[PDB]
Design a protein around this nucleic acid. Structure first.
Lengths: 126, 331, 59, 91, 123, 61, 338, 96
RNA sequence: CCUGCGGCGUGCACGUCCCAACUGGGACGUGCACCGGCCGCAGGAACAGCAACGGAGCGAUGCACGUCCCAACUGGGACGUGCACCGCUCACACAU
């Protein structure tokens, strides 16, 4: 269930995307995967790209939280929206892989310009 | 009671002491002395300044002296502490009591969202620079905490609660916040909510209440309103580390004599070298504000010596009879 | 004026800029009434707030 | 007047007609300190120091024949070498 | 409304009070609007009825004016709200208080209002 | 990594290799987070942990 | 009196035996938990949790460059890939590093057997048969004997053929060798995947564990915000490392003499802890609670109660800096001439 | 670290226990701790390999031997006794 | 006699790239850590004194009421009442 998966998650796992937002987020990741330069997967690459835009989705089932507990404040400073999802397994699956992912950055393209924009709004009001 | 709460939790050096027929508890002082050793937690109106309200309290009360422990700008309401007469000896001790405001602010331009204002408030934490609003000597004061208690986008107007170090210019902090949210902002309203260890819920009465208490006292000899209006100066020192001193040592303290171990009935755990403490009697009256030269372990491990010198004597002389020099030696 | 307040369950001053609190009741301004040293109406306030049970001595 | 200059900081952001800057150098500048340029040309003066006591922001009220847009992010602002205070002074 | 908002007029009496205010606006000499103005008029001893607004906070700003009215025997009552009084004045600005004086043009109306007021009583 | 743990009623760590608790909770990683001397995100870490109350200073003792 | 809750070396202040209560306390020195930031930092330690990849030496150097301290060292050494407890002393508890090198150590080891076994009881009994004074060689050379006081099989999985066991052992014992020996004993061989020190001496999992990020964040808070509570949470006074020793409280005039090499002569003893035996390591401390030094009791506790002159203890390591108290020795009645 | 001097007389070193891979494990009943890489021999002074690991309690312990191609570990049965060169046997005092 | 001080090419982190997890590799430049006794210096030679002779208390433009001009719990104007902005002394004290 999406309720207990969210419940498992960390205290820092807010703002938490609701069920419909999570379906939309998975769809966005799956679409973006089709373009090589439009998803940054992993802690190292996401951190590098953020230091060097889009939406950064974090996984709320990470521990110890110190591995990326600072990156939410980094996103706040850089004005990049962010939201937590109940599991890294789901993000990894949406990325077309079994291995889970702690976080994923989704850029923006014309092909799904609408798609991205919708979720952005839904996460700005969250 | 006050200043005697959890007295059993204080380390006991000796229960053998000499009670004397002198002295009264701070909260049962006869009306004349009660006002002389009290202070008011008043709600400052917006027109008068701190000096003006202090002077008005003096004039209403018909008392010798009056002073305050923090300057509220003319247009800033909030809690003002006004020591009356003898209690004015404690004004200096409160010069650095941490304060707490609820400031209403306005931004000259709209923000993207409430989260922007909340983040800008969050990043104004810790020790930040501050300049007196229009001397030019910059100071540094620390904001312990801050919060955006409310924001409204149509008016561009918000309400944020701040806890800051004593002497912090809230208007300066609001200019800093506006300048920190990228749009510019000024403090259109301010209200001191908590000065030191005093706030709203701690018996904070209004100026009309002071005038009414004075009227009641004069016209029906009803001092109850004046008692609810003026609280003992011992309430300003409930957070201070208490050293209870026997009856026969109180007067020596009054005359400037240092506090010596052979007359310490109790010493509160947590005392440290160079610690501001309250030398109190056995009946709760603040004999003095002292500096402890022995830690609590040192007091427990010694039978004589200098426990705590005097920094500011509060109790008057002759309050207790001269009872020094008749010790065990009698030499 | 701009700053108003209401009371939560614990009575703590919840400070807001809204004229109607979330609970639906009207808000109360956080400021005291303007004071004037030349004010003869102490008797008037004492009697009214003794009538309505609002005086401080009653609390 | 300025024989030489030193780097007070780099551009931060703008707030109305202002140049809020990030001051990397620890030293606190002097209120109304003329913030000069590389080539010894003043561009404004200090109005309010805000920020923490080790990495803060300086507010400059651009005054003369220049604007808050003529500077772009990534540009350093300069200061007279003898217009500062040690950080222990206000501590 | 504030706990001190008594005597309190019912709905019908509130409408009749609004009617009395509206008719008395004809002769602003018989109306007295504002808090300072009603205060000084009461001090000088102007006879009439006084209509207060229970939606006043902090109550200290006007909590005394009911006591002086009782002192000088100038009957009074509270309306549901100050905005209603402002609408009665048609100035789109709330007025916490109003003082109504007696004119022939509305003698019967102000006579009915005062009789009902006396019926209302004082706690 | 291989080693993980879960907290019992008394707060004592109980180690195990499983990725689920005897009750159901996920198992925390025993290995503390990697550190780098050139870490430039102290301010941000404190911001987040103070926002969520995880910073050391907010606990008792 | 209620001294049970007092901090560090003052614990059970009232239970100690009292030689005398007569002396003139001096205001020099502060209680260890309330020193200025400099003295607190210079006289403390950090129960740091080692990151997996770096070495213990690297961790000590990092803590040095973070706290900007001249000297620092670790009681026990951990391998590059081994996490767990790591007590790093700060510039004045370094003098207790030698006394902390013999401290016990509880590890948690994950091991993998070369091939399957009969059942879990096989590994349980194999571990039960490796509990004692075992031979061990340095990894990659002299043989050594190290004691493994206890061991327990925390978990075992058969599909992957991997187990987790917790071992209490004395310093210098390489748990890698213990895993190898267990493998050789079961009857198949084995090795160690990970190691995690859960206790380094008297510092356990819940006893003030901190991480490197915690140290960096406390340093940042003190440097930029000028906030000290975080650095006081990270660093703790060195008296913590000495909470197990039997204490010898001395008069304030005797403190500087001891800091100058003078043995702990009986006249400068206020209170002493019961149970002191000859040649037993003890801690010379002030009434404030600052550990003056570590000495070796040359007298029992009964002789202390029944003696007037002599040498109560012999110095082994002076911790307190010289001149921190005045030279109030030599002014006593029996001090005009030696 | 001598690597010559074919073995001299030998004395009982223990009795055969179990086996782990090519390595052969034997339970030692003598008290002396043998050298490392100390060749082990049968009653005929024919070297079979060398010491690899020494593990076990202080008094009663076990010894692992790695063999030259001249023997397989399964070639020895239960009760088969091993022998050691007396010179390479150090006393317990060296490690006590 | 006691004490203090000092001497006797592997991995780790980050940075830039290639590929094929909170991951596991390489290449290119970076800093970081490792691979008891003797010698010399320094201080002091320590049986741990000091139950009072410098402490304390004193002096050195705005706002409110009232009257008028007009134009909310108000913001303006005129003119009145007011309110705020080194010396002395006391014992010289270990507390029955």
């Amino acid at each position: 269930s999406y309720d207990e998966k969210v419940d498992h998650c960390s205290v820092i796992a807010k703002p938490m995307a609701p069920k419909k937002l999570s379906k939309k987020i998975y769809k966005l990741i799956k679409k973006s995967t089709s373009h090589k330069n439009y998803i940054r997967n992993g802690l190292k690459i996401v951190q590098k790209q953020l230091r060097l835009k889009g939406i950064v989705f974090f996984a709320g089932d990470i521990s110890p939280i110190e591995i990326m507990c600072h990156l939410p404040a980094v996103c706040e400073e850089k004005d990049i929206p962010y939201c937590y999802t109940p599991s890294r397994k789901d993000i990894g699956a949406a990325m077309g892989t079994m291995r889970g992912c702690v976080m994923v950055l989704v850029k923006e393209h014309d092909d799904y310009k609408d798609l991205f924009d919708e979720v952005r709004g839904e996460i700005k009001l969250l | 009671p006050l200043l005697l709460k959890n007295f059993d939790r204080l380390n006991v050096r000796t229960n053998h002491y000499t009670p004397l027929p002198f002295g009264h508890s701070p909260l049962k002082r006869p009306i004349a002395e009660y006002v002389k050793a009290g202070f008011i937690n008043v709600d400052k109106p917006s027109n008068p300044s701190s000096h003006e309200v202090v002077s008005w309290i003096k004039r209403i009360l018909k008392v010798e002296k009056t002073g305050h422990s923090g300057t509220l700008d003319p247009k800033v309401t909030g809690c003002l502490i006004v020591c009356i007469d003898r209690a004015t000896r404690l004004v200096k001790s409160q010069q650095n009591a941490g304060k707490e405001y609820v400031a209403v602010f306005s931004l000259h331009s709209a923000v993207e969202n409430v989260k922007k204002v909340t983040q800008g408030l969050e990043k104004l934490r810790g020790a930040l620079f501050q300049r007196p609003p229009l001397k030019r000597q910059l100071r540094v004061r620390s904001v312990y905490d801050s919060k955006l208690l409310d924001f409204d986008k149509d008016r561009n107007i918000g309400v944020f609660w701040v806890s800051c170090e004593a002497g912090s210019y809230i208007r300066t902090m609001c200019v800093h916040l506006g300048l920190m949210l990228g749009v510019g902002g000024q403090m259109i309203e301010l209200r001191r909510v908590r000065s030191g260890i005093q706030g709203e819920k701690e018996g904070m009465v209004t100026m009309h209440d002071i005038l009414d208490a004075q009227w009641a006292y004069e016209n029906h000899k009803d001092e109850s309103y004046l008692r609810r209006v003026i609280k003992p100066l011992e309430g300003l020192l409930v957070a201070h580390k208490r050293i209870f001193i026997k009856d026969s040592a109180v007067n020596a303290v009054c005359y400037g004599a240092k506090v010596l171990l052979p007359g310490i009935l109790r010493y509160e755990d947590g005392i440290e070298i160079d610690q501001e403490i309250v030398i109190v009697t056995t009946k709760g009256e603040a004999v003095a504000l002292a500096i402890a030269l022995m830690t609590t372990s040192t007091m427990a491990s010694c039978d004589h010596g200098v426990a705590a010198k005097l920094k500011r004597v509060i109790m008057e002389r002759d309050t207790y009879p001269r009872k020094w020099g008749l010790g065990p030696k009698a030499s | 004026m701009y700053l108003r307040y209401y009371l939560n369950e614990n009575g703590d001053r919840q400070y807001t800029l809204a004229t109607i609190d979330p609970y639906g009741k009207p808000t109360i301004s956080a400021h005291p009434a303007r004071f004037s040293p030349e004010d003869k109406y102490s008797r008037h306030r004492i009697i009214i707030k003794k009538r309505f049970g609002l005086l401080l001595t009653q609390q | 007047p300025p024989e030489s200059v030193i780097p007070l900081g780099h551009y931060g952001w703008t707030v109305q007609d202002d140049l809020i800057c990030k001051v990397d150098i620890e030293d606190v500048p002097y209120f109304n300190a003329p913030i000069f340029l590389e080539n010894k040309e003043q561009i404004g003066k200090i109005d309010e120091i805000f920020g923490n006591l080790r990495d803060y922001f300086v507010s400059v009220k651009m005054g003369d024949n220049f604007k808050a847009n003529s500077f772009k992010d990534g540009q350093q602002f300069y200061i007279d070498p003898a217009k500062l205070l040690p950080l222990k002074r206000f501590l």
